[PDB]
């Protein structure tokens, strides 16, 4: 008990890192999560300097060597209501609110350095918004959520979540603002970058595959792009995680397959480090990307020899918890086939205690990348199993929106099997199940539908009425509610685990923010009131002046601890 | 360093932990202990204990002396404390048999006498006195509230009833034919009885002054003073009186106490005993036999007069120098009342340093020079602990005890209030923290909503929010104990309750709640609950699975008081 604590403490407080971009001429921008917090920093040699003083959220993108950073910053005490605060880079440490942007939930933005251009959330609308010197203008309104991706010039392109689960590509004006729409017919788009000819490159994800083509946003019209070398092609890329244009002009894209990315510079092979990769930067003449793995907290490598600019150095005690990781395909319901991380404990014996380790979203995915959770529970003495259920990102198209108007349904089965795997296959004595957001609501879920699969159950900022969360959810959350549930109320009620509680038997352990403005905490006190009043087994922890974006360690071991502690409680009986 | 913390804490409550329960199975001690992670009921016989029960257990049946049974009762409600009677023969260890006759309801006390099983019990409907002999169960006689067997010799049982008023009357019943008397002193109440050779009932009589002793004729209702051969219990001169019993040698064995610390007789005798306090007392091998605590020693089986012990669990070094010395002060309330006060410094700390305001339940109880885990984890985690007698504390007198009836949230709040202002202005304070468990935390909820901007932040658990829904969720023993502290009128229980108030609040809350507590329920704390994120509050919450009110695992203990410890750390961290 007290060394799973120091375990855990350990595990949050090795330090993590993200690369946004370059600035102040030639040095590295890079959100931290170190010493306390997510904090915003500069890399050019050499030491970091901080450049915000309280915790942050994150930066905008930054356009190449502007001469500021704009920090993201909850001033709702976690309720995910942002200020934007600008930093000159000349002098780190003093920060100057935008007073003309009201607080918001702040989805994305790029700084050109003569305007920030952001979307946002109000209980009244999705929007665009653009703010220079002139004041702030609202550019277009959204229909649901939306991420500016690039901006040229007076090009502003990016990506929406507009309807059924598909993923647009948008265009404005910077100027004049505006929207134009274009929708595939294959797919959905996941990533977009402006070319030097004014048109629009975007990955585009279909059934089971990925490609790069290029939109035309004056007449709407797309072909399919071909790069000098053969190696990006020829990798057979089943998504695409990031693109963009480097100052010299070459065109950086990274692609996945299988839980594993792969960098290419204009379309041939860059060689990194095995695991996953974020953007790729060009400073002083070098490709430098983030780097991770399930190994490998996130940290900042330079390409294409593999070595570190920035890594924290996990201790060598904690990496030997994990004993090994595969991936393995278990055999759902209907024959589809659900590719599953797996990491056996070296501290649990085989077969051992075994949690299922449900990721949120639903768009997205249990990939080879650092996951803090699955590492404590590893350390804690449980084999971890992570199940990309469909609704998935990473597999095509096809797997994920497969999950569209089906909540607590076809997903649920994968996650089942995935659970009926890890016994028949030897590795699991005992089977829980854990989660967090859209995990949590499966948790819930299996437990409500499916009572005597799991031991007992993990619920994190869940989901537990679609109903009740929709009547205090703000545009951005109405709107992508709709699309997970096909818009049908007889689909919001059947499907919420708030509807099901009599049929609950096992332990339950609920753990949730207070100021969750995403999964709201009010529902889930009705949920309390059905488990007490129908006799069930609860636990309930509810952590103070916090909401869904955890940017403390404070706040993330008060989240985790409780879980861990659970989890050994009954494993110990 | 949170993981030191959990250590200490974990090591504070794994300390074994004994009361003294009676003889059995000819001359072997029966001592319940809070051992091997869980409470259970043991035998001592000069060398290793043996475990009787299986399961953990919450209490056991006061046995007569050398019965060759027990009688454990067990809550089989997760935690609601609705109880079932298990008898083991002392024979044979580890083997139960459940007393089917008997259904579950909340068992409140019981004595054994081999030939029969008598005790009392709430039920939804009404609160009891039962007598289980070998002819089934039978209902002696019905009782206005709670109330507590205290002795059985022959046919006559005696005992002690809350009956009206915050008093505490003498009641008797026959063992064969039922029926009830009761006999109520205009001077104050009994807290203890003792049935003498001559079939009267020996008493302790707490008045608003002295305590002494009397002897209570059941036949015709009348009193007299007793006198004793030794006048040492007399020149104590004691407020207050613990516990009394007739020795199987016929002696009169009393313990009494003043200011927070006891004292044992033997016929009115002084006899010596380590400094603290001190339970029931038990004739074992020719030799005496009590339990023994305090601030600096989690309880215990000793000797007298040697004080050597049968049964510690051994406190730690590093613990005991935590805490860097105790005091009691007499801290200046609003009316001119003098509240007693006990003071623990922390060694961990500085002073002045950070300093929590632990208010203790009930409302009937005291602060004593008695182990108390909650405040001896505080000192480990380096606060100061303060500890204020609010009047309707017992110890000092019937009168500072009824001051509180009628008037919760009122007079006593005051007293808490005044004793967090004396830890200030005195020098021991640069901060200051309120905690508290049941009325204690009833006491956290008033003091932040009445009180905004004494404290820095509280603790409230398993707490009082809300006196009417908690009469309509109560049970007949609850529903009467909750009238008689608010005098019954329903402005009282609707004005002195936090839940009106919430408004108010400024200050950092955590709430810690066993879910199935039967006392202190936990749906009027969801509607708290409620309350707090509507209006914006700042909170913290921490609901624990299948408990309740009496904590009886060591797992259960963490979960109560670890969440706690944790919260005022983070709030120190915070300046």
Same mark, same amino acid.
Request: net charge negative.
């Given at each position: 008990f007290s060394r799973?604590?120091?375990? /855990?403490?350990?595990?949050?407080?090795?330090?993590?890192?993200?690369?946004? !971009? /370059?600035?102040?001429?030639?040095?590295?921008?890079?959100? +931290?999560?170190?010493?306390? #917090?997510?904090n915003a920093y500069l890399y050019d040699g050499g030491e970091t300097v901080k450049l915000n003083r309280e915790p942050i959220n994150s930066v905008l993108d930054p356009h190449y060597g502007v001469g500021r950073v704009i920090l993201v910053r909850d001033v709702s005490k976690g309720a995910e209501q942002h200020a934007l605060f600008k930093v000159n880079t000349s002098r780190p440490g003093e920060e100057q609110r935008l007073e003309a942007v009201k607080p918001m939930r702040i989805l994305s933005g790029v700084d050109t350095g003569?305007? /920030? &251009?952001?979307?946002?959330?109000?209980?009244?609308?999705?929007?665009?918004?653009?703010?220079?010197?002139?004041? =702030?203008?609202?550019?277009?309104?959204? *229909? !649901?959520?939306?991420? &500016?991706?690039?901006?040229?010039?007076?090009?502003?392109?990016?990506?929406?979540?507009?309807?059924?689960?598909?993923?647009?590509?948008? @265009?404005?004006?910077?100027?004049?603002?505006?929207?134009?729409?274009?929708? #595939?017919?294959?797919?959905?788009?996941?990533?977009?970058?402006?070319?030097?000819?004014?048109?629009? @490159?975007?990955? =585009?994800?279909?059934?089971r595959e990925a490609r790069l083509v290029t939109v035309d946003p004056r007449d709407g019209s797309v072909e399919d792009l071909e790069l000098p070398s053969k190696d990006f092609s020829s990798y057979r890329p089943t998504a695409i995680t990031w693109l963009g244009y480097l100052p010299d002009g070459r065109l950086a894209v990274v692609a996945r397959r299988e839980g594993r990315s792969a960098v290419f510079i204009d379309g041939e092979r860059v060689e990194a480090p095995q695991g996953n990769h974020g953007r790729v930067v060009l400073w002083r003449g070098k490709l430098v990307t983030s780097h991770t793995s399930l190994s490998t907290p996130p940290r900042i490598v330079s390409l294409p020899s593999g070595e570190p600019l920035l890594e924290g150095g996990l201790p060598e005690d904690l990496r030997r918890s994990i004993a090994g990781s595969r991936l393995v395909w278990v055999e759902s319901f209907d024959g589809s086939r659900v590719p599953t991380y797996v990491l056996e404990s070296g501290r649990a014996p085989t077969?051992?205690?075994?949690?299922?380790?449900? %990721?949120?979203? *639903?768009?997205?995915?249990?990939?080879?990348?650092?996951?803090?959770?699955?590492?404590?529970?590893?350390?804690?003495?449980? %084999?971890?199993?992570?199940?990309?259920?469909? +609704?998935?990102?990473?597999?095509?198209?096809?797997?994920?929106?497969?999950?569209?108007?089906?909540?607590?349904?076809?997903?649920?089965?994968?996650?089942?099997?995935?659970?009926?795997?890890?016994?028949?296959?030897?590795?699991?004595?005992?089977?829980?199940?854990? +989660?967090?957001?859209?995990?949590?609501?499966? @948790?819930?879920?299996?437990? @409500?539908?499916? *009572?005597?699969?799991?031991?007992?159950?993990?619920?994190?900022?869940?989901?537990?009425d679609w109903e009740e969360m929709y009547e205090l959810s703000d545009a951005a959350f109405r709107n992508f509610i709709e699309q997970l549930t096909g818009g049908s109320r007889e689909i919001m009620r059947s499907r919420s685990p708030i509807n099901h509680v009599d049929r609950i038997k096992e332990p339950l352990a609920l753990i949730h923010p207070q100021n969750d403005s995403r999964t709201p905490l009010k529902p889930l006190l009705r949920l309390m009131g059905e488990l007490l009043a129908r006799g069930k087994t609860f636990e309930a922890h509810i952590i103070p002046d916090a909401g869904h974006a955890i940017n403390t360690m404070e706040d993330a071991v008060k989240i985790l601890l409780p879980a861990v502690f659970f989890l050994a409680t009954q494993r110990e009986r």
């Open positions: 799973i604590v120091r375990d /855990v403490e350990r595990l949050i407080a090795v330090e993590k890192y993200s690369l946004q !971009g /370059v600035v102040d001429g030639d040095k590295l921008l890079v959100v +931290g999560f170190s010493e306390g #917090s997510v003569e305007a /920030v &251009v952001f979307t946002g959330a109000t209980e009244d609308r999705v929007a665009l918004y653009a703010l220079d010197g002139g004041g =702030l203008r609202e550019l277009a309104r959204l *229909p !649901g959520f939306g991420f &500016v991706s690039d901006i040229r010039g007076d090009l502003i392109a990016g990506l929406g979540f507009f309807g059924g689960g598909r993923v647009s590509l948008f @265009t404005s004006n910077l100027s004049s603002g505006g929207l134009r729409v274009f929708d #595939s017919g294959e797919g959905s788009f996941s990533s977009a970058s402006i070319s030097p000819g004014m048109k629009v @490159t975007a990955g =585009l994800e279909t059934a077969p051992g205690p075994t949690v299922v380790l449900v %990721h949120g979203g *639903p768009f997205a995915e249990d990939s080879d990348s650092w996951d803090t959770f699955a590492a404590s529970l590893a350390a804690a003495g449980f %084999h971890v199993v992570m199940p990309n259920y469909r +609704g998935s990102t990473g597999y095509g198209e096809e797997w994920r929106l497969k999950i569209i108007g089906d909540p607590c349904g076809g997903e649920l089965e994968d996650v089942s099997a995935a659970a009926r795997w890890a016994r028949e296959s030897g590795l699991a004595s005992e089977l829980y199940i854990m +989660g967090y957001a859209y995990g949590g609501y499966m @948790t819930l879920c299996a437990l @409500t539908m499916k *009572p005597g699969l799991f031991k007992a159950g993990v619920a994190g900022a869940s989901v537990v």
